[PDB]
Amino acid sequence: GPSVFLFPPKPKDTLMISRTPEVTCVVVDVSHEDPEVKFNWYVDGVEVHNAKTKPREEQYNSTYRVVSVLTVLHQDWLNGKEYKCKVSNKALPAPIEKTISKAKGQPREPQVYTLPPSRDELTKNQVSLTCLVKGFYPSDIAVEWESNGQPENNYKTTPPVLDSDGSFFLYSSLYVDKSRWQQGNVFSCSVMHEALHNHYTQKSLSL
Amino acid sequence: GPSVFLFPPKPKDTLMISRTPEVTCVVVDVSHEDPEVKFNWYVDGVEVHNAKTKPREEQYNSTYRVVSVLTVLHQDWLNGKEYKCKVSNKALPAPIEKTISKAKGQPREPQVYTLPPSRDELTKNQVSLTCSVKGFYPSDIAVEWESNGQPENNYKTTPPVLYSDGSFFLYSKLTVDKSRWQQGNVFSCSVMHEALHNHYTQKSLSL
Numbered sequence: 001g002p003s004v005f006l007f008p009p010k011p012k013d014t015l016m017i018s019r020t021p022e023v024t025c026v027v028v029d030v031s032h033e034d035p036e037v038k039f040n041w042y043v044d045g046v047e048v049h050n051a052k053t054k055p056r057e058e059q060y061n062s063t064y065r066v067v068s069v070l071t072v073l074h075q076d077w078l079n080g081k082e083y084k085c086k087v088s089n090k091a092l093p094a095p096i097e098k099t100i101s102k103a104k105g106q107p108r109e110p111q112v113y114t115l116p117p118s119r120d121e122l123t124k125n126q127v128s129l130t131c132l133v134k135g136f137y138p139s140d141i142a143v144e145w146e147s148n149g150q151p152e153n154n155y156k157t158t159p160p161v162l163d164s165d166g167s168f169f170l171y172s173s174l175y176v177d178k179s180r181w182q183q184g185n186v187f188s189c190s191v192m193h194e195a196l197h198n199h200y201t202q203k204s205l206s207l
Numbered sequence: 208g209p210s211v212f213l214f215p216p217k218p219k220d221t222l223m224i225s226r227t228p229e230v231t232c233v234v235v236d237v238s239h240e241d242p243e244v245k246f247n248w249y250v251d252g253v254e255v256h257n258a259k260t261k262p263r264e265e266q267y268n269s270t271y272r273v274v275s276v277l278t279v280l281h282q283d284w285l286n287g288k289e290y291k292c293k294v295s296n297k298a299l300p301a302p303i304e305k306t307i308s309k310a311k312g313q314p315r316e317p318q319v320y321t322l323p324p325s326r327d328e329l330t331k332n333q334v335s336l337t338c339s340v341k342g343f344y345p346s347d348i349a350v351e352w353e354s355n356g357q358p359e360n361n362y363k364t365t366p367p368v369l370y371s372d373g374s375f376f377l378y379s380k381l382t383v384d385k386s387r388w389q390q391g392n393v394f395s396c397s398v399m400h401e402a403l404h405n406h407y408t409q410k411s412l413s414l
């Protein structure tokens with residue numbers, strides 16, 4: 001029978017009024033026998049009717065994939081409302097229901113700390129600039145780097161890790177040329193999270 | 208079902224001759240009728256006979272979970288030999304085979320750097336001591352912390368993250384009392400990896 005995956009908005013999308021947060025309900029393994037798929041959507045159990053279902057697309061394994069997209073109000077997602085996708089197909093014993101929402105719990109403001117390169121690293125070509133983001137809840141967060149207003153490419157961020165107290169931490173590492181650092185350029189760690197003032201903070205770093 | 212999952216040894220176990228590395232073959236979704244399951248094990252195609260089947264554990268959905276544990280030679284796992292778990296059950300059309308081995312490729316030695324607390328953090332009760340381990344391959348690694356020979360409790364380690372060059376990094380974070388740090392105790396990050404001399408290195412940290 002067919003399978004359903006329900007996907008949440010991206011963190012940045014819910015934190016910025018300029019962006020468009022969406023919940024996405026994907027049905028795969030729809031057969032040729034029974035290709036009609038119905039979607040019902042509920043917000044905290046109350047049916048809504050504004051979702052955009054794009055038309056089915058047969059995959060290269062001869063099953064159909066159909067997608068339905070519900071736009072969410074920023075504040076609804078953040079006030080913790082619950083999004084239910086109900087999928088009907090005549091090849092199911094019963095309809096499939098998936099639910100999604102923000103992780104439950106009291107939001108906690110991340111602490112952001114920049115850490116310079118270890119002395120040992122300075123006799124390398126590259127140097128790692130570190131951004132420690134700890135104490136946050138839920139785990140949804142965006143981290144970015146920049147210097148003089150231009151975004152930086154060459155950085156990697158760990159997944160959020162669960163701390164003993166139920167909050168999360170992560171580290172972001174920006175790899176720069178030793179020279180750029182040692183001439184004293186300003187590097188900035190950006191953090192976006194619901195529990196920050198204006199959903200944004202920036203922490204700077206130089207020699 | 209039934210379905211089979213095949214798990215590698217723990218990093219520490221393969222890196223120390225004193226410990227016992229095992230590969231673990233887990234079967235799930237075996238029913239109450241025929242919970243009979245046979246395991247065959249091969250090391251680079253050659254059958255071995257020293258695996259131990261631990262007793263069934265039914266779970267709250269009334270399917271059985273059945274586990275078989277094969278202890279492996281340290282050097283075999285590290286020389287990249289291939290471990291095949293073959294599962295037989297009357298509810299299979301044909302037997303299930305899973306294979307596992309160490310990630311292929313030249314091992315690379317982790318670079319290990321301890322980073323003191325951010326200035327900002329020093330006006331907290333707790334302080335974060337950081338251990339940056341980068342440049343290592345494969346991703347199998349153990350990190351531990353200590354002071355005066357005694358292990359530390361209160362630390363968390365990120366999973367390995369893939370860098371742009373195909374190697375991995377992680378961070379380990381040790382949370383201590385400000386006092387302990389500011390009295391100038393020595394804190395040590397231990398790292399165990401196959402590409403280190405004696406599979407082990409240690410880096411120290413103090414005020």
Ligand SMILES: *[C@@H]1O[C@H](CO[C@@H]2O[C@@H](C)[C@@H](O)[C@@H](O)[C@@H]2O)[C@@H](O[C@@H]2O[C@H](CO)[C@@H](O[C@@H]3O[C@H](CO[C@H]4O[C@H](CO)[C@@H](O)[C@H](O)[C@@H]4O[C@@H]4O[C@H](CO)[C@@H](O)[C@H](O)[C@H]4NC(C)=O)[C@@H](O)[C@H](O[C@H]4O[C@H](CO)[C@@H](O)[C@H](O)[C@@H]4O[C@@H]4O[C@H](CO)[C@@H](O)[C@H](O)[C@H]4NC(C)=O)[C@@H]3O)[C@H](O)[C@H]2NC(C)=O)[C@H](O)[C@H]1NC(C)=O
Pocket residue numbers: 003004005007024026028029059060061063065
């Ligand atoms: C037939 O074909 C279709 C279509 O595939 C296409 O055509 C075929 C022929 C090939 O050529 C393919 O290469 C080609 O792509 C097959 O459809 C696939 O079906 C599988 C399941 O059989 C689905 O698996 C799920 O994948 C999601 C992740 O999917 C996202 O990321 C993928 C990239 O890695 C990407 O391909 C997907 O499109 C999708 O992308 C996301 O889309 C949203 C909305 O569009 C977007 O906003 C996101 O940004 C975007 N993300 C990215 C990364 O770009 C994965 O999460 C699922 O995992 C859950 O379920 C598994 C059980 O199946 C389980 O093992 C996992 O652990 C996991 O379990 C979940 O865990 C969470 C906790 O983490 C828990 O809370 C959840 O409750 C739990 N989930 C459930 C429901 O229990 C899952 O693996 C493929 O996505 C799907 N592909 C597409 C494109 O639809 C089909 O399988 C083929 N049929 C047969 C019979 O072979």
Ligand SMILES: *[C@@H]1O[C@H](CO[C@@H]2O[C@@H](C)[C@@H](O)[C@@H](O)[C@@H]2O)[C@@H](O[C@@H]2O[C@H](CO)[C@@H](O[C@@H]3O[C@H](CO[C@H]4O[C@H](CO)[C@@H](O)[C@H](O)[C@@H]4O[C@@H]4O[C@H](CO)[C@@H](O)[C@H](O)[C@H]4NC(C)=O)[C@@H](O)[C@H](O[C@H]4O[C@H](CO)[C@@H](O)[C@H](O)[C@@H]4O[C@@H]4O[C@H](CO)[C@@H](O)[C@H](O)[C@H]4NC(C)=O)[C@@H]3O)[C@H](O)[C@H]2NC(C)=O)[C@H](O)[C@H]1NC(C)=O
Pocket residue numbers: 210212214215231233235236266267268270272
């Ligand atoms: C009935 O219940 C049982 C019991 O489950 C328990 O009870 C139920 C009711 C629920 O409450 C559960 O939440 C609860 O756990 C169900 O049994 C489960 O069955 C599923 C599916 O059959 C299994 O899924 C797989 O799990 C592995 C992860 O396994 C480790 O981590 C789990 C926690 O996340 C943990 O539960 C496991 O026990 C295990 O933990 C490790 O165990 C070994 C054992 O020796 C130990 O040495 C380790 O140290 C230990 N680690 C630690 C510290 O925890 C998951 O990885 C699998 O996903 C792979 O395959 C998917 C395809 O199915 C794919 O989507 C994933 O991405 C992933 O595959 C990756 O990519 C490809 C495939 O695309 C693959 O080839 C790659 O190898 C792989 N890459 C890498 C590197 O990851 C998979 O999801 C559950 O583990 C299992 N739970 C238990 C405890 O047995 C049962 O299904 C239920 N029956 C019914 C009614 O259906």
